[PDB]
Design an enzyme around this catalytic site. Sequence first.
Site, short mmCIF file in Angstrom:
data_model
loop_
_atom_site.label_atom_id
_atom_site.label_comp_id
_atom_site.label_asym_id
_atom_site.label_seq_id
_atom_site.Cartn_x
_atom_site.Cartn_y
_atom_site.Cartn_z
N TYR A 82 0.83 -1.20 0.00
CA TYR A 82 0.00 0.00 0.00
C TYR A 82 0.85 1.24 0.00
O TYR A 82 1.91 1.25 0.61
CB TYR A 82 -0.85 0.06 1.25
CG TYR A 82 -2.02 -0.90 1.24
CD1 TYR A 82 -3.24 -0.51 0.70
CD2 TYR A 82 -1.90 -2.16 1.80
CE1 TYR A 82 -4.36 -1.35 0.73
CE2 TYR A 82 -3.00 -3.02 1.84
CZ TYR A 82 -4.24 -2.60 1.30
OH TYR A 82 -5.34 -3.45 1.38
N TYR A 122 -1.70 -9.68 0.92
CA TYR A 122 -0.93 -8.88 1.87
C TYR A 122 -0.73 -9.53 3.27
O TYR A 122 -1.71 -10.00 3.79
CB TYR A 122 -1.79 -7.58 2.04
CG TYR A 122 -1.29 -6.50 3.01
CD1 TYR A 122 -0.21 -5.68 2.66
CD2 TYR A 122 -1.83 -6.38 4.28
CE1 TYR A 122 0.36 -4.76 3.56
CE2 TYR A 122 -1.28 -5.46 5.24
CZ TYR A 122 -0.17 -4.66 4.86
OH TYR A 122 0.45 -3.80 5.75
N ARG A 145 -4.04 -11.54 3.91
CA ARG A 145 -5.32 -11.16 3.32
C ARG A 145 -5.33 -11.67 1.88
O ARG A 145 -4.28 -11.70 1.21
CB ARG A 145 -5.41 -9.61 3.18
CG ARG A 145 -5.47 -8.78 4.44
CD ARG A 145 -6.55 -9.17 5.46
NE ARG A 145 -7.82 -9.58 4.90
CZ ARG A 145 -8.71 -8.79 4.28
NH1 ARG A 145 -8.45 -7.49 4.10
NH2 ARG A 145 -9.85 -9.32 3.84
N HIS A 201 -7.60 -8.07 -2.51
CA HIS A 201 -8.90 -7.42 -2.36
C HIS A 201 -8.84 -5.95 -2.72
O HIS A 201 -7.77 -5.32 -2.73
CB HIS A 201 -9.39 -7.48 -0.91
CG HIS A 201 -8.41 -6.86 0.06
ND1 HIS A 201 -7.23 -7.47 0.43
CD2 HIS A 201 -8.43 -5.66 0.70
CE1 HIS A 201 -6.58 -6.68 1.27
NE2 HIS A 201 -7.27 -5.58 1.44
N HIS A 226 -10.82 -2.41 -1.59
CA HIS A 226 -11.67 -1.79 -0.60
C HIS A 226 -12.62 -0.86 -1.37
O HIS A 226 -12.18 -0.23 -2.33
CB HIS A 226 -10.85 -0.91 0.32
CG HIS A 226 -9.92 -1.67 1.22
ND1 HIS A 226 -10.29 -2.05 2.48
CD2 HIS A 226 -8.68 -2.19 1.00
CE1 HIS A 226 -9.32 -2.78 3.02
NE2 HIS A 226 -8.33 -2.88 2.14
FE LIG Z 1 -6.52 -3.94 2.62
#
Ligand SMILES: [Fe+3]
Lengths: 238, 238, 238, 238, 202, 202, 202, 202
Positions: free
Chosen positions: A106, A145, A155, A158, A160
Amino acid sequence: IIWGAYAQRNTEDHPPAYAPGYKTSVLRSPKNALISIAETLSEVTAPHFSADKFGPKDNDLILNYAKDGLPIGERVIVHGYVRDQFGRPVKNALVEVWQANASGRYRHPNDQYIGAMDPNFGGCGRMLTDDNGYYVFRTIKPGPYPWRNRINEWRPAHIHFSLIADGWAQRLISQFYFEGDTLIDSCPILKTIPSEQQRRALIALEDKSNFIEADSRCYRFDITLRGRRATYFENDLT
Amino acid sequence: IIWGAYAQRNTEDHPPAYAPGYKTSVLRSPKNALISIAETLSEVTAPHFSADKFGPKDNDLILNYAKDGLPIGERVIVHGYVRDQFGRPVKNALVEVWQANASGRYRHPNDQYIGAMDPNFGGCGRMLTDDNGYYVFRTIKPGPYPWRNRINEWRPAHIHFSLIADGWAQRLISQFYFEGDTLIDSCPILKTIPSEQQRRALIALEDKSNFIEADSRCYRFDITLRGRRATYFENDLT
Amino acid sequence: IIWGAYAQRNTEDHPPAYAPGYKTSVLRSPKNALISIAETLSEVTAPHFSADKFGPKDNDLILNYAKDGLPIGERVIVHGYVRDQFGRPVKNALVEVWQANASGRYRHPNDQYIGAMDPNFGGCGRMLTDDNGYYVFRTIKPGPYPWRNRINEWRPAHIHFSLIADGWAQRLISQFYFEGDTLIDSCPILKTIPSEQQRRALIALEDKSNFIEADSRCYRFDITLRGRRATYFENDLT
Amino acid sequence: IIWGAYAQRNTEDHPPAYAPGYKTSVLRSPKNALISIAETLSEVTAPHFSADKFGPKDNDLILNYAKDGLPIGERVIVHGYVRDQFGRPVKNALVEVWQANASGRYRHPNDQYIGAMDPNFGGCGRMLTDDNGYYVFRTIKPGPYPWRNRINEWRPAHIHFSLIADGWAQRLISQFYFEGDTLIDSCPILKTIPSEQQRRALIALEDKSNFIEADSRCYRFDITLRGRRATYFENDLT
Amino acid sequence: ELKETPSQTGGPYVHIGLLPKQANIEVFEHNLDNNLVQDNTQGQRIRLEGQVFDGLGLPLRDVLIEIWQADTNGVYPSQADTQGKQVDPNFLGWGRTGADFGTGFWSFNTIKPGAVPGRKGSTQAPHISLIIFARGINIGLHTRVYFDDEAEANAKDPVLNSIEWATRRQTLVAKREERDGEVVYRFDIRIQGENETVFFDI
Amino acid sequence: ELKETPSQTGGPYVHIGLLPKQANIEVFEHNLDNNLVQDNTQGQRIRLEGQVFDGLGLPLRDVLIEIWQADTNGVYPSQADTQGKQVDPNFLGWGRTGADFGTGFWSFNTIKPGAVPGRKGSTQAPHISLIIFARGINIGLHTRVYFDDEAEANAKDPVLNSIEWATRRQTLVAKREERDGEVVYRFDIRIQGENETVFFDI
Amino acid sequence: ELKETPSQTGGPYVHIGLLPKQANIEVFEHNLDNNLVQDNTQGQRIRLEGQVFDGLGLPLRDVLIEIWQADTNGVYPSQADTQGKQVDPNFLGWGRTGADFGTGFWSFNTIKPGAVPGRKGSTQAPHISLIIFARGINIGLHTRVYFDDEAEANAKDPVLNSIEWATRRQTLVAKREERDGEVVYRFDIRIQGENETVFFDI
Amino acid sequence: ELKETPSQTGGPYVHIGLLPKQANIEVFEHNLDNNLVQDNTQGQRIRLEGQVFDGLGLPLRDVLIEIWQADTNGVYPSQADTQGKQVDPNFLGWGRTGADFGTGFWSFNTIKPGAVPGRKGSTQAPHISLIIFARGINIGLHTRVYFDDEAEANAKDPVLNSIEWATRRQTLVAKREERDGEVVYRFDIRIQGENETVFFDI
Ligand SMILES: [Fe+3]
Ligand SMILES: [Fe+3]
Ligand SMILES: [Fe+3]
Ligand SMILES: [Fe+3]
């Protein structure tokens, strides 16, 4: 048509606030039950965002942050329809999305994962749905992630998303996943949702006929918001 | 026969104290586990109520509060047997019942529902079981009742009941529902009971052969209380 | 589009005239078979009713006969769509309904059942469907009614309805019942219909998302009428 | 206990009056439906028969008509219980039986079948049930009997029986058959009964533990009559 | 709960078991019959007679009939009678008969019954309950016999008035005649067709 | 073997059926109440009073309470009492009350109970068995009330000593006071939280 | 494709919903009735009356009847009429009535209809479409009323000639009478039995 | 009917998508923010500020907050407002902000809202609707902010009065302060524990 209140949110279709398998929820969940209220004008209204303020690449995550070249990763288009629970299209709703890059990294100060940053990828976009409730954006498929819930938690890939629509009562933030990702079955965040059918409602489906040859794949993902009931007798809203 | 203690209450056959879907239980449930004790004379005894004090219409909810006419609603007889868990009849137990009227309205100061009050209906009755553990009362079928748990919550039609029998350990208050009511499947109060078979133990069954022509329908509903074990060796009760 | 005749009524989808289990049909059924005719203008036309003549409470059975207070019983809204057999909406059709009160008592000279009369309930309403074929009315749920077919016969709770629409050939009177009523399985009138799927077409379904909090429940019930075929070759109607 | 009326006869558990496959019913069945009435003292009472008038061999079909020797055929005992529909024993009811002999021949002027007559067999008996509703008689198993319905029609082996009990409303005449007889599946008289479970209620079962060695076999056959409901409120019988 | 044992026709030889004498079988010392009048029985003696006709208008010559009725004061000789009145001690209240194999005629010697209480404080007109069994009849048919000389009582009878087709009420009224000082009520039963007798589900 | 019928909350209107007077419904001539003292009842009269608090420290104003106890000599007015001693003939041993809708206060007028035999030859300190029902409470909660002036008996009580967390024993002891010659025991119940009252599975 | 909703009897109280006035319920300001003649309606006024009989020859006193017909020039006041002719603007073409609870008589005040086009260039004789609903009738029964003074037109009518049993055609013809200058057509309907009225599946 | 898409936590990086500037991402020319006051906006300017605390009493430094409110005359800038009144044309009614990563403080610059109609002719006290999203929060939490200087209006507010535990009503009232002529309302949110803020299901 005289509109009445939004239908009650079905709490059994959503995760509970306290969900011990998702560790940070333990200290960030109220101990008291939510107090339900009868809706007023405050809950049935919401803001309006004009298309005029949106730039031409706001829904193009491949190019909206590109500086020297294209971002690295899998080119994909995501599209679908936003409807209310009675099947009516949700028009001119604000859809905002954010995600990691192809490495699962990110662009955020608090992210220190070793997955490499991509100088040509930002990771956020937005768009308004059209009169049919349709939306479409293009991006790079995000990588899964790792994070610290249990020490080796991961995770699934995905994106968001957030919706601001016709009524404040419809306000919703969630995440969608990609068909076939094996991490979907192990994610404690996805497992906070009680039912298997609701977990499946967050999986975007491969849309093969809509792939663009020698260019991009495509995923289809529809979203359902709470819907308003119509009133035919007493109108107690005000 | 020398009687020993009542069998242990099977906690998995009852709702837990804390049941978040029934919101008012969140602040009215102990956080500590219950402390189990070995029974003494205090737990195996209970009061005796003489039939002499009961009026002739105490078990007739259709007429016991009627002033100018009959109450409005569906005439029904409810009957059945009270037994202990080993199948023995429970004799001379005090059964008290209360319920809303045909509109789903309770004759209680704290009930402000718009369903209409019935000037000829009170909503409470009582009776003693006979030597076979049989009871019978007549009433108006109650209407379902909205209430604020989630904002649009509705109780299925139900009759509240209470039993005081042979031992204080048997003391029980519960509610029974009517076969086929679709609200039974959505009620968060009924869902506090863990097992489907136990939820079904609270549904009164249509008893068609016992309807009274051109007069009243009939529902059959049996109740099971905790039972005492017999002692054949050491008697440690005292 | 040039319209031709209505499709043939499928007699196997309806009750026969002679149905011995419904005793009064024995003397009120023709012994000769019906004579089928080819339709003319007489069968494909029907009257038009103007909305101007309908009062504001004609579809509100809770208030249209209320004098001193509200009627006693379960507040419910019933709504749905009227379509023809090819799925087209039936616009501006006259829908008339009638029923007993909460006690199972009809406000009719010939009804002597002991169920109590309600001074604030009349039991009839009417409305025109809109351009989408939609209708909506509000009432008190009726109670089941004993009657003399066999001596202890009981009708399930029901609302009688009548439709006058676009063609005289569509003229229909029937009755709908409420999801879950156990009497549905024993009614000899409902059993005159040969097939189980057609018996189910008369059951109104609980519509929980459309209940109005702290006010009324809601049932959904759609109606299907005969439909006209279009003509693309010879038009022999006249 | 104050007794009210007998429960309604369930017409779907019995044959209809008109049953075209049983040819003589075509002219001996009413065309009008039966008129159901509410019961009075006339329907709930019945005569009493004293045991004093019964001879010692009235329930012994093997010896009650024997003159020079024993009848030819299979020695069998038939026994069972008569109960009402709520399971209560039917005490002191008059049970009368009649049947053909081992050849399928009836001792009746109108029977001309070639099966041989047995000079030592009469074919009728009677008995009163005891306080437990029990009855027992001994006979020769009857042979199947040809008759003219269709030209080659054959009745399975059967014993005709009649019961006069506590109320005139219970009056019943029927026939029972023997486990395993292949003619049971082809008999148009047995097929007048609509349901398979009710046809099976007329089959007496082999009771092997009750055979009497080197003497007689035994069949068990229970009979169920209509039962009275108890009254706990208004008693309108008189 | 259990289901009632299903009915089946009595068949053509119903006499073997229920009236062995008519079939010439002497196996019982005491035989049930169509004579309800004992020497000390109270009341006016009457003879009830008639024929049963099928749908072609032909008499049934194999039919079996039973009657059940109250004594002269309207009390049933049954433990289930709740009137608290003493019943005539020399009255069974029940009888059985078969139609003659040749003519089809049937009869009973009995007493004219007194009026019996109806439901909810009403009074029933004098009547005899009658049941018919025969080959071709799958379930015994119940009817009642009222008397034409009780016109006032008949007009107020609850059961007769519960028949909504008023024209059919007359099929339940027997006609009084007088053969040599004896009072005779003639009651023909038409199972099917014109002037079909009313049958009840009781 | 059968399973016990499952419990369900009494709900907010538990008064309609169990204390109709508090809901202003006069349908019964004899009404059950919170007065266990009859004129000839033996023993010292006491008043038991308190409030029931939820997890926020607020009183429950819709709670229903019942008590069950022995007479002054420690005998229960129940056929199941096996002591072979005669019980006071003017004592029911049971009472029922509701908290006041405004203040939340509840009370009973009763008698201080005598000591009752415990298991295996032990002796229980004087106590009253108490049960609580209300909206939000899925199964009635059982507790006991002991008396602070019976310190010696309390110290030897089998049930109190069976509570291994000694600090919680004190939640079961009511405090004796004296309002105008009347003896009053104050017993507040805390359903949840700090100083939570001990509840038993009996 | 969907199946038509199945029919069910109107039942004995069909008046509550369709003729509230006959049941003494005043809930509607405008009430549908049996008078199709408005002051400016064109045509000759006629009265149509009769009774409906069951299989015993008894009138139905709980029957509900509706009629649908064209105006005096044979045009239907319906958007589905394709004749391209202007219909009388003061004519609904429809009416509803109930048989009298005591006598069983029913009637309508209407106008004699003009001839309407039949299929394939034919011409139908003047007729009124009629439907019957009642307790005991599972599906509304459709029939037509023709007029005995239109013998020539009746003889050429397509629907009447489609009835192959010629003897039954007469059950559909009403008889013209004249009560005090008023023209009255009498049309009795026999649901079952001798001279049974023809019913159509339309 | 369809089911609502299920909620999932916003997660720790909710800023990338909803406040890219706070994450140092300049991809949008127009950025949504926490300033609802435009130059011509009508009303008294106020600053709303506070912190959000977890169950340990520690501030959330990754929380995202939005508010929705009416203009100075109590009209919502939304097509769904049915008051028929004209709304201030220079007012969005909505804003979004994030807590500071170091201190946890959040704020908005807005206007004090006017009173809005409540249901059934009632009037709501002035309030701002607020929602909270963050890592650990599975569904956005809804609450309202009322003002301590509107004590009279607050006392009559329908929603505040619908909270039956009166002691919790105070958690929804912000405290008015005055920093250099500027009016500031301080509203701290306690997600869990003592003085836990009331959250609504709307
Ligand atoms: Fe996330
Ligand atoms: Fe036979
Ligand atoms: Fe309740
Ligand atoms: Fe009906």
